[PDB]
Amino acid sequence: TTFRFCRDCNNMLYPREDKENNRLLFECRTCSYVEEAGSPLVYRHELITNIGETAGVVQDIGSDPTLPRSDRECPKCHSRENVFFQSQQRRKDTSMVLFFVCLSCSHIFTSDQKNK
Amino acid sequence: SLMSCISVGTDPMPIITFLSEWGMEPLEDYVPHQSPDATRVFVNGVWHGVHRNPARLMETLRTLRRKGDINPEVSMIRDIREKELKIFTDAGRVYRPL
Amino acid sequence: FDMGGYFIINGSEKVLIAQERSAGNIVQVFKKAAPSPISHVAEIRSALEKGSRFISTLQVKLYGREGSSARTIKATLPYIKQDIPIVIIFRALGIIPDGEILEHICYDVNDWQMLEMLKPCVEDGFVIQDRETALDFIGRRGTALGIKKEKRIQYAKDILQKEFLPHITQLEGFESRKAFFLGYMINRLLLCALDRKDQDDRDHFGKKRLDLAGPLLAQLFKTLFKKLTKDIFRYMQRTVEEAHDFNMKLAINAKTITSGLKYALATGNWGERAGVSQVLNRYTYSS
Amino acid sequence: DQENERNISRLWRAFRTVKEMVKDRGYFITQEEVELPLEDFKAKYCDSMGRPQRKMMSFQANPTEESISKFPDMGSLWVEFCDEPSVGVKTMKTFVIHIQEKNFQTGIFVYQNNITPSAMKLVPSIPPATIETFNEAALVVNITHHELVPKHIRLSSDEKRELLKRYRLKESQLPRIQRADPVALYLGLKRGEVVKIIRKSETSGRYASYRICM
Amino acid sequence: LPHFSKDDYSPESKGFVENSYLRGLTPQEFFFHAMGGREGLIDTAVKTAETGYIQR
Amino acid sequence: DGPTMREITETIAEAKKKVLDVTKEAQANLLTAKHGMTLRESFEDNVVRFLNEARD
Amino acid sequence: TXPGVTXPGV
Amino acid sequence: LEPGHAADQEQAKLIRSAIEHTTLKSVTIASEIYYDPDPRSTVIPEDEEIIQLHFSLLSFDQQSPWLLRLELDRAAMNDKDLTMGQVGERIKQTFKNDLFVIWSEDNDEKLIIRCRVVRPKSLDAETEAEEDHMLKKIENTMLENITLRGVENIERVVMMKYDRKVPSPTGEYVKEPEWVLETDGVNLSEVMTVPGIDPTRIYTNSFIDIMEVLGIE
Amino acid sequence: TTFTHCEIHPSMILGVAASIIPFPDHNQSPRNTYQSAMGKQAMGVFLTN
DNA sequence: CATATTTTGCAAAATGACAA
RNA sequence: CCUAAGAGUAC
DNA sequence: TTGTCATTTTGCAGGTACTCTTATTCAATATG
Ligand SMILES: [Zn+2]
Ligand SMILES: [Zn+2]
């Protein structure tokens, strides 16, 4: 969705119909700041959310001692050592697919097979 | 358990002074946009600010507690995934030696 | 071989069993059952060790089920009869612009899911666009109902200073810190609602504290000495209104502290809970 | 037309259940009518346009010789099907006046969706005429053929008197059956009437119970 | 337990006692068996109370 | 006796290997969820059944 | 419920 | 099942599909709201084929420029006997002509449903601003209120193979297998009337429903 | 091999009453609970004085 | 100096409208 | 003597 | 001249026996 704020009073901008050009127009509700629309999308509702499963990855995620290590192939460094963890989305119906972070390149690669 | 003890509680002011000295940003002038990947520092459940280099801060806090400058009953937890740093000095915490 | 660690009350050996309780000043988020309208509740049992030592429970509740559309987040402030919307609280603390409020709540610009889930709150609070207006709103919801309109602002200020998140501070000028903490609580609530983290386990032993003889005797003595000092003040007022002479010995009543401590330790009850103090078992050394 | 086919199939099942209900009540309905096939029903009660007609689907039944001997107080019965999904006051009034002027002691109204409460209040007409309303959805499956549902036989007044006399019972000491139970509605029980229940017990082969309508 | 890595679904990590009572239980297996026995005792107490009430 | 203990250890090892193979299938998402339950529930059901029949 | 665990209801 | 089709596995599958409740919430991957200035062309290149089929096959001047787009799940349409035509017909029937709905074909790479609320001839100078909100409300009710197939209070149906004792024509009681449906949730009155099953032999854990549907005995 | 700490001894997870049990790891756990509750009722010398 | 008084589990019943 | 509380036995 | 639908308040009780010990009975100001 990528919500955007007014640059005059730092307030929300809502979508608005236009007649002269028949275009989406973002408007302020308190200072009448009006501008164009970057995208026609104004509302996204993720019934099945794919993002958030790799959330929590940090530039020094390897410093965590509780995270298990692995020697699986890294398809950017060909390095053995890396850390791995399951999906971070805590929904009960998520799959048990694993994610790997290389400690020398910080590239996240999965163990999935349908995607590959 | 045989080796389990209960903390008696200490004054958190020295730890707050250590945090301020070592580079803890005060919470009053913290703007999340300019410091997105900042580790929030909690002392006894009070969010006191953010730190931009949590690894060095945790290392020096561990060194201070391991030489006795910080009371050993004080518990320091670094949650990397959540990007949080919690320090507890209150009484009633049950710990064991390792 | 006797190890000590027990009292002798009236010739009987009494031991104070370590009383377990939930830790204070920790934010805990819990899901709610289907019949309830609120789906998730984030609460903190705020308490200050070096003050009045009173428990004030702040709750942040997310109204509406998963299929509901009006998902408004409301906070239960102490001494307020209604659940105030969160954005009203942010504006009362001194953060008027919506962008700054959302920055205080959501720390990631790309986290558009949290922004979408949080838009109903700003939509609800659009009616109030000023700090004084929000303070008046809170005062109007104030349960005292004995304050004139222009002093409702002061009443709300007192609520937000000495009653809202006491564990942070009791002084003034720290509105930003309390606003940041409220944003953090709402952030935790929204993370739990977005199925990004599980609800907090109430049985996690790291969230529990054991009150030993120290804290128990401390709170009992605090109450008992408050009683004694109130008695001292009452005696002083009585002897100054009657213009009689003032004496220290006639003022203090050591029987208060002595009898209170002896009663709390002699009987199980801990007041003026049960079974806090028990007769020490002497059947066997291991016992 | 699949919706039309399922609707006419449900209507045919309802018609079969209604005929079974009337025959079980003691009236003279031949076995052939009960087992009427789908094609014959569609030829008779459905027009060329494919829309079944209910006006000519309503019918009249009469008690058989055995029922007359056992129940020498009950006469002809009328079963009506409504066409419009919602039954108004005017249609119910026409039905009840038609029942009254034809001297029917019982009249079954079979409706599609619902009856207006303004028509429910006028359902109780002048005695001894009684009006029973049934929903076609509830009449799709004959509950009495379920193995959990045992055999129900209405008792005559003489039989009820004999039952109370032999067992030294009062009216209230019999087991009760509500005057809203699906089987009681199926058989048209009135309050005070006793049904004998034949059951396949497992300790003895056959067990007979009795339930009084309340 | 803090003796296992994160996201370990192996039988030993989630409470499979591969040792007999004759051989003896490892500390983790001992703790897991203690958890199972605690569940059994709690169930026994709850069951006897509930059955008493139902019987009355 | 010795041979019986060796056979028991072999059986336990074989069951643990089957559990490891099921875990590899689940972690590769190749496992299919049983109708009426999620992926994780099916995986847990299979693991528990394997361990139970191993003990038996 | 019950009580405990009136009814519902009453 | 009906005795003549007790072991017929595909008939059991047919009945399982017939009774199991399915909602759009279990099928729609995601939903979106877009601003298309004209209801004749779209700004999304992916679904332009859908519009250039539907408009070519076929009035449109009274359609709101706001559009609601639903992306469905291929697996949901696979494991259950559901297709784009069926769900489109269900939406059209439950919303009458108030909502213009188009859908991609089943063989298409992405399952897309595009909806536009029709514009009444009465001009409104304020409903245009809240049109997006109205569409949101319509999407909300379209997620749960409408049912694709199956009767209500049926969370999930599973199929099992039972083995009963049937008297053989020669005299003995032989073991004969049947397919049996176990259903989460109880809608006994509505399930019992479904054709293809044996109405006599239906049974329920909830004896309250049995009592209120079948009788006190 | 990424350990940060080491247990001083696993047998220190037990309490005072359970530390008396010989070979507690060869027992069914309810038996250990029974002995823990029952050794407090054991008879001996509680104090030397 | 001594006795007297200041955690848990919901379906409804009730309410405020209401609409012509 | 009453009341309250605590500990415990067998289920 | 009749249905409608949609928020706000409504009551609670927890198994059977049995053993032992400990504390406590309103404090204190006020008038006869
Ligand atoms: Zn603006
Ligand atoms: Zn790499």
In this structure, the number of other CB atoms found within 10 A of the CB of residue C50 comes to 7
CATH number at residue A33: 2.20.25.10
Contacts of D179 (CB under 8 A, 6+ apart): D189, D190, D191, D213, D214
User: Per the structure block, which two tokens stand in for C49?
Assistant: 């060790």
- Find the CB nearest A90 among C98, C99, C195: C195
Contacts of D18 (CB under 8 A, 6+ apart): D79, D108, D110, D134, D139
Task: For residues H67 and H132, give the distance between their C-alpha atoms in angstroms, rounded to a whole number.
Answer: 9
For chain H, what is the HEC assignment?
CCHHHCCCHHHHHHHHHHHCCECHHHCEEEEEEEECCCCCCCCCCCCHHHHHHHHHHCCHHHECCEEEEEEECHHHHHHCCCCHHHHHHHHHHHHCCCEEEEECCCCCCCCEEEEEEECCCCCCCCCCCCHHHHHHHHHHHHHHCCCCECCCCCCEEEEEEEEEEEECCCCCEEEEEEEEEEEECCCHHHHHCCCCCCCCCCCCCCHHHHHHHCCCC
Residue recorded with tokens 């009992």:
C220
Task: For residues D96 and D124, give the distance between their C-alpha atoms in angstroms, rounded to a whole number.
Answer: 9
Closest CA to D78 of D55, D100, D95, D61: D61
- Is the domain of A65 the same as that of A104? yes
Contacts of C186 (CB under 8 A, 6+ apart): C42, C60, C73, C86, C105, C118
Contacts of I2 (CB under 8 A, 6+ apart): A65, A69
* D106 SS3 class: strand
Contact list, A96 vs chain E (CB under 8 Å)? 9
**Is C104 within 8 Å of C96 (Cβ atoms)?**
no
Task: For residues C17 and C171, give the distance between their C-alpha atoms in angstroms, rounded to a whole number.
Answer: 37
Task: For residues C1 and C4, give the distance between their C-alpha atoms in angstroms, rounded to a whole number.
Answer: 9
Residue recorded with tokens 């009216």:
D171
C25-201 under CATH 3.40.50.720, yes or no: no
* DSSP-assigned states of every residue in E12-43: TTTT---S-TTT---HHHHHHHHHHHHHHHHH
φ, ψ for residue C95, nearest 5 deg: -115, 100
Nearest nucleotide to G5, CA against C1' atoms: J9
Is there contact between C11 and strand J, defined as CB under 7 Å from any strand atom?
Answer: no
User: Per the structure block, which two tokens stand in for H182?
Assistant: 């176990």
* DSSP-assigned states of every residue in chain A: ----B-TTT--BEEEE--SSS---EEEESSS--EE--S-S--EEEESS--TTSSTT--TTGGG-SSSPEE----TTT--S-EEEEE-----TT----EEEEETTT--EEE--SS--
- Asked if F43's CB is within 8 angstroms of A95's CB, the reply is no
Q: What's CA H89's distance to the chain center, in Å?
A: 10
Footprint of strand K on the protein (CB under 7 A): C 268-269, 274-275, 278-279, 281; E 45, 48; I 37-38, 41
Task: For residues B69 and B63, give the distance between their C-alpha atoms in angstroms, rounded to a whole number.
Answer: 9
Is there contact between C99 and strand J, defined as CB under 7 Å from any strand atom?
Answer: no
**Is D204 within 8 Å of D184 (Cβ atoms)?**
no
Query: What ligand is nearest to the CA atom of residue A12?
Result: 1
Q: Work out how many domains chain A is built from and give that number.
A: 2
**CA-to-C1' distance for D70 and J1, Å?**
102
- Is the domain of A93 the same as that of A111? yes
Task: For residues A25 and A22, give the distance between their C-alpha atoms in angstroms, rounded to a whole number.
Answer: 9
Contacts of H1 (CB under 8 A, 6+ apart): H8, H11, H12, H15, H178, H179, H180, H181, H196, H197, H198
| Terminal-to-terminal C-alpha distance of chain H | 24
Please say whether the dihedral angle defined by the alpha carbons of residues C67, C72, C78 and C80, taken in this order, is positive or negative.
negative
| Terminal-to-terminal C-alpha distance of chain D | 45
Task: For residues E18 and E13, give the distance between their C-alpha atoms in angstroms, rounded to a whole number.
Answer: 12
Nearest 5 degrees, angle CA H187-CA H189-CA H195?
Answer: 100
Contact list, I3 vs chain A (CB under 8 Å)? 65
Residues 1-10 of chain G sitting with CB below 7 angstroms of strand J: 1-5, 7-10
Task: For residues B93 and C23, give the distance between their C-alpha atoms in angstroms, rounded to a whole number.
Answer: 9
What are the beta bridge partners of residue B83? none
Query: What ligand is nearest to the CA atom of residue A74?
Result: 2
* E11 SS3 class: coil
Q: Is C69 on the interface with H (CB under 8 A)?
A: yes
**C-alpha distances out from residue D26 to A82, D19, D187, H188, I40, Å:** 84, 11, 10, 29, 80
CA atoms within 13 A on the CB side of H206: 12
In this structure, the number of other CB atoms found within 10 A of the CB of residue C250 comes to 11
Residue type at C199? Q
For F43, counting Cβ atoms within 10 Å of its Cβ (0-12 exposed, 13-18 middle, 19+ buried), the class is buried
Query: What ligand is nearest to the CA atom of residue A30?
Result: 1
Residue type at C177? R
Contact list, A66 vs chain E (CB under 8 Å)? 2, 5-6
User: Per the structure block, which two tokens stand in for B12?
Assistant: 């958190």
Task: For residues C18 and C21, give the distance between their C-alpha atoms in angstroms, rounded to a whole number.
Answer: 10
Pairing between β-strand C73-76 and β-strand C84-85 as defined by DSSP bridges: antiparallel
User: Per the structure block, which two tokens stand in for H212?
Assistant: 């209120």
Residue recorded with tokens 């972070």:
A101
Task: For residues D21 and D142, give the distance between their C-alpha atoms in angstroms, rounded to a whole number.
Answer: 8
Q: Is A93 on the interface with B (CB under 8 A)?
A: no
φ, ψ for residue C57, nearest 5 deg: -100, 110
* I6 SS3 class: coil
- Is the domain of A72 the same as that of A38? no
**C-alpha distances out from residue B34 to B47, C114, H131, H183, Å:** 18, 19, 37, 55
Residue type at C75? A
Closest CA to H115 of H54, H73, H27: H54
Residue recorded with tokens 């595909």:
H10
**CA-to-C1' distance for G2 and L20, Å?**
36
3-state helix, strand, coil in chain D (%, to 5): 35, 20, 40
Breaks in chain A (C–N > 2.5 Å) following residue: none
Nearest chain C CA: its distance from A42 CA (Å)? 10
Contact list, H28 vs chain A (CB under 8 Å)? 47
Q: Reading across the β-sheet that carries D77-81, which strands appear in turn?
A: D59-61, D77-81, D106-111, D130-135
Task: For residues H116 and H98, give the distance between their C-alpha atoms in angstroms, rounded to a whole number.
Answer: 9
Task: For residues A98 and A88, give the distance between their C-alpha atoms in angstroms, rounded to a whole number.
Answer: 10
Task: For residues F23 and I11, give the distance between their C-alpha atoms in angstroms, rounded to a whole number.
Answer: 32
φ, ψ for residue H29, nearest 5 deg: -70, -45
- Asked if H210's CB is within 8 angstroms of D141's CB, the reply is no
| Structure-derived torsion over alpha carbons of residues D1, H82, H4, H163, reported in degrees to the nearest 10 | -160
Contacts of D132 (CB under 8 A, 6+ apart): D106, D107, D108, D109, D185, D188
**Rounded distance from Cα A5 to ligand 1 centre (Å):** 8
Task: For residues H134 and H118, give the distance between their C-alpha atoms in angstroms, rounded to a whole number.
Answer: 12
- Asked if C109's CB is within 8 angstroms of B46's CB, the reply is no
Pairing between β-strand D114-115 and β-strand D86-87 as defined by DSSP bridges: parallel
Task: For residues B22 and H137, give the distance between their C-alpha atoms in angstroms, rounded to a whole number.
Answer: 53
- Is the domain of A87 the same as that of A62? yes
Task: For residues C191 and H191, give the distance between their C-alpha atoms in angstroms, rounded to a whole number.
Answer: 40
- Is the domain of A26 the same as that of A51? no
Residue type at H194? V
Q: Which residues of A are annotated as a binding site?
A: 6, 9, 28, 31, 74, 77, 102, 105
Task: For residues H192 and H15, give the distance between their C-alpha atoms in angstroms, rounded to a whole number.
Answer: 12
What number of residues does chain F have?
A: 56
- Asked if H199's CB is within 8 angstroms of D182's CB, the reply is no
In this structure, the number of other CB atoms found within 10 A of the CB of residue E54 comes to 7
**CA-to-C1' distance for D61 and L21, Å?**
86
Angle formed by the axes of helices B13-22 and B54-66, nearest 10°: 140
Task: For residues H211 and C256, give the distance between their C-alpha atoms in angstroms, rounded to a whole number.
Answer: 68
- Asked if E7's CB is within 8 angstroms of A66's CB, the reply is no
Nearest chain F CA: its distance from A99 CA (Å)? 10
* DSSP-assigned states of every residue in B35-89: -TT-EEEEETTEEEEEES-HHHHHHHHHHHHHTTSS-TT-EEEEETTTTEEEEE-
Nearest chain E CA: its distance from A46 CA (Å)? 26
| Terminal-to-terminal C-alpha distance of chain C | 14
Angle formed by the axes of helices C86-93 and C112-125, nearest 10°: 80
What number of residues does chain E have?
A: 56
Task: For residues D79 and A64, give the distance between their C-alpha atoms in angstroms, rounded to a whole number.
Answer: 80
- Is the domain of A23 the same as that of A64? no
Domain with A110, as residue range(s), is 46-116
Question: Which residue is nearest nucleotide L15, judged by alpha carbon to C1' distance?
Answer: E52
Best residue in H35, H63, H111, H126 for a mutation probing chain A (most A CBs within 10 Å):
H35
Is it the case that chain E and chain I have 3 or more CB pairs lying under 8 Å apart?
yes
* D126 SS3 class: coil
Q: Which residues of A are annotated as a binding site for Zn(2+)?
A: 6, 9, 28, 31, 74, 77, 102, 105
Nearest 5 degrees, angle CA A38-CA A43-CA A45?
Answer: 135
For H148, counting Cβ atoms within 10 Å of its Cβ (0-12 exposed, 13-18 middle, 19+ buried), the class is middle
What are the beta bridge partners of residue C31? C40
Residue type at F3? P
φ, ψ for residue C17, nearest 5 deg: -70, 135
- Asked if B2's CB is within 8 angstroms of I14's CB, the reply is yes
φ, ψ for residue D80, nearest 5 deg: -125, 140
Nearest nucleotide to E55, CA against C1' atoms: L15
Task: For residues E49 and H116, give the distance between their C-alpha atoms in angstroms, rounded to a whole number.
Answer: 61
φ, ψ for residue H88, nearest 5 deg: -60, -45
Contact list, I2 vs chain B (CB under 8 Å)? none
Contact list, H89 vs chain D (CB under 8 Å)? none
| Terminal-to-terminal C-alpha distance of chain G | 9
Task: For residues H143 and C128, give the distance between their C-alpha atoms in angstroms, rounded to a whole number.
Answer: 33
φ, ψ for residue C249, nearest 5 deg: -65, -40
User: In terms of C-beta distances under 8 Å and separation of at least 24 residues, what long-range contacts does H1-7 make, across chains too?
Assistant: H1/H178, H1/H179, H1/H180, H1/H181, H1/H196, H1/H197, H1/H198, H2/H196, H2/H197, H2/H198, H3/H198, H5/H196, H6/H176, H6/H178, H6/H179, H7/H177, H7/H178, H7/H179
**CA-to-C1' distance for I34 and K10, Å?**
14
Nearest chain D CA: its distance from H216 CA (Å)? 7
| Terminal-to-terminal C-alpha distance of chain F | 18
Q: Reading across the β-sheet that carries H112-117, which strands appear in turn?
A: A43-46, H28-35, H66-72, H112-117, H99-103
Task: For residues F26 and F36, give the distance between their C-alpha atoms in angstroms, rounded to a whole number.
Answer: 17
Contact list, I39 vs chain C (CB under 8 Å)? 284, 286-287
**Is C165 within 8 Å of C104 (Cβ atoms)?**
no
**What does the DSSP 8-state code read for residue F31?**
P
For chain C, what is the HEC assignment?
CCCCCCEEECCEEEEECCEEEECCCCEEEEECCCCCCEEEEEEEEECCCCCCCCCEEEEEEEECCCCCCCCCEEEECCCECCCEEHHHHHHHHCCCCHHHHHHHHCCCCCCHHHHHHHHHHHHHHCCCCCHHHHHHHHHHHECCCCCCHHHHHHHHHHHHHHCCCCCCCCCCCCHHHHHHHHHHHHHHHHHHHCCCCCCCCCCCHHHEEEECHHHHHHHHHHHHHHHHHHHHHHHHHHHHHCCCCCCHHHHCCHHHHHHHHHHHHHCCCCCCCCCCEEECCCCCCCC
Q: List the single residue in E with minimal CA-CA distance to A88.
A: E7
Nearest chain E CA: its distance from A59 CA (Å)? 19
A27-54 burial, b for 16+ CB within 10 Å, e for fewer? bbbeeebeeebeebbbbebbbebeebbe
Task: For residues E9 and F22, give the distance between their C-alpha atoms in angstroms, rounded to a whole number.
Answer: 11
**Is B30 within 8 Å of B64 (Cβ atoms)?**
no
Nucleotides of K under 7 A from a protein CB: 4-9, 11
User: Per the structure block, which two tokens stand in for E44?
Assistant: 């026994």
Nearest 5 degrees, angle CA C94-CA C100-CA C105?
Answer: 100
Query: What ligand is nearest to the CA atom of residue A62?
Result: 2
Q: Is C99 on the interface with A (CB under 8 A)?
A: yes
Residue recorded with tokens 């309508």:
D213
Residue type at C10? N
Please give the domain boundaries of chain D with CATH numbers for all domains: 1-141 (3.40.1340.10), 142-214 (3.90.940.20)
Q: Is H156 on the interface with F (CB under 8 A)?
A: yes
Nearest chain A CA: its distance from C188 CA (Å)? 14
- Asked if I6's CB is within 8 angstroms of B1's CB, the reply is no
Please give the domain boundaries of chain B with CATH numbers for all domains: 9-90 (3.90.1070.20)
User: Per the structure block, which two tokens stand in for C248?
Assistant: 């220290």
